[PDB]
A paper describes a structure:
Mtb fructose-1,6-bisphosphatase (MtFBPaseII), the enzyme encoded by the glpX gene, is the third component of the glpFKX operon involved in the growth of Mtb using glycerol as the sole carbon source. MtFBPaseII catalyzes the only unidirectional step in the gluconeogenesis pathway of the pathogen. MtFBPaseII comprises the only FBPase activity in Mtb and is closely related to the class II FBPase from Escherichia coli.
However, apo MtFBPaseII was not found to have a stable tetrameric structure, as the subunits appear to be associated less tightly. This observation may suggest that the binding of substrate/product could alter the inter-subunit association of the 222 tetramer. The T84S variant structure has the most visible residues in the structure, ten more than the apo structure. Extending forward and backwards from this narrow passage, there is considerable polar space in the proximity of charged residues (Lys274B, Arg277B, Glu301B and Arg305B). Weak inhibition (IC50 of ∼2 mM) of MtFBPaseII by citrate was experimentally confirmed after assaying a panel of di/tricarboxylic acids.
Numbering used by the authors:
A (entry chain A), C (entry chain A): 0 to 311
B (entry chain B), D (entry chain B): -2 to 305
Amino acid sequence: HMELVRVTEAGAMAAGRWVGRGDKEGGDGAAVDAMRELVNSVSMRGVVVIGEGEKDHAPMLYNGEEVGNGDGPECDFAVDPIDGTTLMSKGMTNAISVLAVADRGTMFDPSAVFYMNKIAVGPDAAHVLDITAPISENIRAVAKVKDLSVRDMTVCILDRPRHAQLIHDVRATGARIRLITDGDVAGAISACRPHSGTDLLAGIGGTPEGIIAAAAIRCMGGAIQAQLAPRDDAERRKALEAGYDLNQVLTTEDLVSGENVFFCATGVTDGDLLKGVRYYPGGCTTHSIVMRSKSGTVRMIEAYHRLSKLNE
Amino acid sequence: GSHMELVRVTEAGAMAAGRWVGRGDKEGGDGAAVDAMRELVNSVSMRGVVVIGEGEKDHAPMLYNGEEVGNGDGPECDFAVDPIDGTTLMSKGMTNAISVLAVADRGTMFDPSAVFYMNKIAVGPDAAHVLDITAPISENIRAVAKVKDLSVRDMTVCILDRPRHAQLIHDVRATGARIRLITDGDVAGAISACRPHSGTDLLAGIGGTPEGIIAAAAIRCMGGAIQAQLAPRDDAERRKALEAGYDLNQVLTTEDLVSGENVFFCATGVTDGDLLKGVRYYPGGCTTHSIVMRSKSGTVRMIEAYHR
Amino acid sequence: HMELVRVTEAGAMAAGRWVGRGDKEGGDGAAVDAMRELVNSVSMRGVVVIGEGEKDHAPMLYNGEEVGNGDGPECDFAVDPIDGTTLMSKGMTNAISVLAVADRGTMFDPSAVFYMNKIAVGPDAAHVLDITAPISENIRAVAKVKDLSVRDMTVCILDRPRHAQLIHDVRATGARIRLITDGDVAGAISACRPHSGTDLLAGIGGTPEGIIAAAAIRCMGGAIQAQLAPRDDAERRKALEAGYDLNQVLTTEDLVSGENVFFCATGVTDGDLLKGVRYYPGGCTTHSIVMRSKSGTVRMIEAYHRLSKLNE
Amino acid sequence: GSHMELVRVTEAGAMAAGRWVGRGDKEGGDGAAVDAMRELVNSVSMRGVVVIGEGEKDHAPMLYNGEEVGNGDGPECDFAVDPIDGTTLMSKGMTNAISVLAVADRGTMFDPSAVFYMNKIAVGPDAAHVLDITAPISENIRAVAKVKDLSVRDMTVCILDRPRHAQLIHDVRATGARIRLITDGDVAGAISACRPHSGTDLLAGIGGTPEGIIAAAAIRCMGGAIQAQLAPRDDAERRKALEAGYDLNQVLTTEDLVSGENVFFCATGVTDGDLLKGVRYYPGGCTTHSIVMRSKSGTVRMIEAYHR
């Protein structure tokens, strides 16, 4: 329901007061607290599948917690109160507050392994992706299915040392790189939205971000492919002991299946799709995206919040 | 406590109205819009009565004054619908056709057929405190202009183009202000007056009483002020109103027109206007542009929807 | 040169003060006077080919007059200080102030006959037009070359009694009609601009408006076809005696030939492409289009004019 | 007296810079931008000298400090070019790369290598009258906020992300304001400060002296104020400036930085920024987004160009 946008609107507005203030935990707490107060007010019966972590040293929106007013069917609840906490704390671009809802039990287990390799593309080339192939074959494939020259392709990649080869290969095909410092989820949405200046998202990031990204892709169209990415053999055992086929190419629908999927986001700082919170004498504005798998409707929502009296 | 889902009602009205723009068929557009809006309001979870609508039930089968509408009996509230504000504009492909819905606590909407027309003045939040419909239009113009920090000749006054407004136009012209004459679209006019960088600084003139009420709902949520006084047609109507309880000397404020504490208003562009883009079609679906506002919070939402 | 936009900017700003004020001549004089003062200041050597009329009871920008600072090659000069004077006087939409420049002698004679039948289309169907055929065959042709359904075609037509059959035919094909009360020139630009919601302009209007429309079409792309339209047999003699082949289908390049063509316009009231003049405490804004045949570059220009002191 | 044709210089810079965004090649983008800008300025009809440019002529072949540029010797004027403000941002595909040109009466531009860095503060027209670079940053914040009618915690202060600004950041944070840290882009930062609904209420910190001069040109035309004081690196430079004629205690105003009566400034988006969209390509050509302003008239033009 469109009401869920008020959850990310509250998370963005709380985080807005911490933009640039060098306090990551201050910003997270504000957003987490505003989001939970407002989510326990929406007509919804939810369990936190993706959130701040497990119960002990994450006392709010911990994985397992119940959320919503009490009524409604039960459903999976994923929340990233600030995707890009460090971006927020330093006043840098592309921080967003993020929520996704899906049928109960239909979200992948975010704790399987911390990281996953991802590639994502918009709808027109949703069926030519292969994460097992080198990035060049994916670039060339997508550039052909989209009929563009390869020097006009843009690949969004997190700027990390572990990506030195991924970055070199993309350049060596002549395509371009949009280097982001954080925001896997925003990066995927960018690759999937019509003519955004970004054709492909590629690289290794977090397993929760990948699941949250898949929920949006289930709504706006396109495809993500993923494989788990153990950080060492210790985690690789833990992943195998738990019963994961570490060679499976996980698809959008593996990460979030289920008939009904909701995604919405609101900008914290100015970014690639959403403007961040802006302040005025009377109040503030927020910029939000809201989407739904069943209809496929996508709404862009600009909201003025008068934090004051009428007619001042 | 938010009810953004009511945007679906004007979104449906406008998507129906939109397959009729530019076809010369005023009633075909109205009819389709009323259809889709009736289907959709009876699927939102709040029971209300249609207080302002398509006339009454002997020759308006749908959205007639008094119809029970909505799905689950939540709280009862007033419903005012204008399936196309700008039906002629819609038929001829012209700008500023919008589809409008208003909802307020049950009983709190003024009576729409007490008198058919009422004289109006309306201005936005920044100059609402100088309004005086009993003063001449020149004094409102100069007062509004001073507050707004504009010369009188920078001012732009929106007036309906009707024979009845010949003296009003003369007196507005005599002051030095510009005029924006509209053929119809009384609601969108008043909303323009209350938006900042819109081009309309003031709305004035005699329009319909339902449109005045719908306008007041909007203003309740976004800020500003409209003042009105009933303007009976002839001698029968002036009797009908005096022996109804109304002081004809009375200035009606926004809150007299819509007095509820919970007012909601939304509108969706049919054709391109100075506030909302019109519905645009392409193969996969269409896009609508809407405004949704709530008086309790004072929150105003611009909603651009891509339907698939 | 982009400097020419200041001519239409001045014409719009002068007319702005007459919007809605019920005085057609007041508005025309203001615009005519502001345009001429500013055109005699641009690096240009011009002769007024299309203007306010002949020398006697049109004392400013009369057909024949010299314009510009004195320097430069000589060139044809067309000016419509307010296209839609009645729209301006009543505060109605779509009034614009209009200027076109072309090689000297390369503009059609605007006095041949008062009126002309016109049809105009954007570039993608610029080669399937035929003004001699019924409107239906032109609609269907354009709808096929554009691959759209015919019920999705929109035809812009002046609302005049002399168009009762043109309007009936367009409806009878199921296409839509954008009924305008004035603004031939704006209507053509609308039909020729990419995705404007207007596919075709059709009908009889003024010969100067048709020539001014062709100058823009020489710049932004597309096609106009025209034939002169005598209002009676008296004018038909005058047109024949002067040596016109009243059956010629005049083309864009017949109306304005010449290697170099300039067009620009600025909104007076709010319209289909340009916003009208808007007033603020410090000043005003104008909205303008400027285009050039040789480059094909089209510029949209928003200008804030501070009619005051700096930093107030 | 208008010279809108100078937009072609940054339009060419940005169209060259744009075929390099997202390629990791900072110098390949710079080089292409300098190329096209040199070609184009030597084809506009006003002779000037490059006063601010790509360094000096032994290892900057083009746009070196002192180069005669322009076509026909009109009046002689000062030329300041920044072919890409945001070269690193351009190489990495990030926002806010712009291509910049500034021109003023000959001799009226401050000397760019008197000192390399200068401390800066800048704000827009509405609060320019409270600026005081000699006061602490907290007092400017609260003063600017009062004028702007904002709480201190609504304020947003743009600061370069450099080790040298650790105390500045601490003192800005200590007041309650938000910060917008930028990695580079000193010019675009200051222009943001002077635009209304931009998100940046104040710019502060030590940046380069050329960028400060280019910024003052902009401000001369659009309104607002920048204040600066020279900030010599070490002991050699502080001598170089004292025995050059400069009072180190001196507050420099906008007009001290650019003193001409005729200043022009234009900029074109390279990548998307908070003021200008970046160059976008398609098959037939491309589109650029530019700002052109002139101090004599105070006219500001947003120019969206479709090149074929």
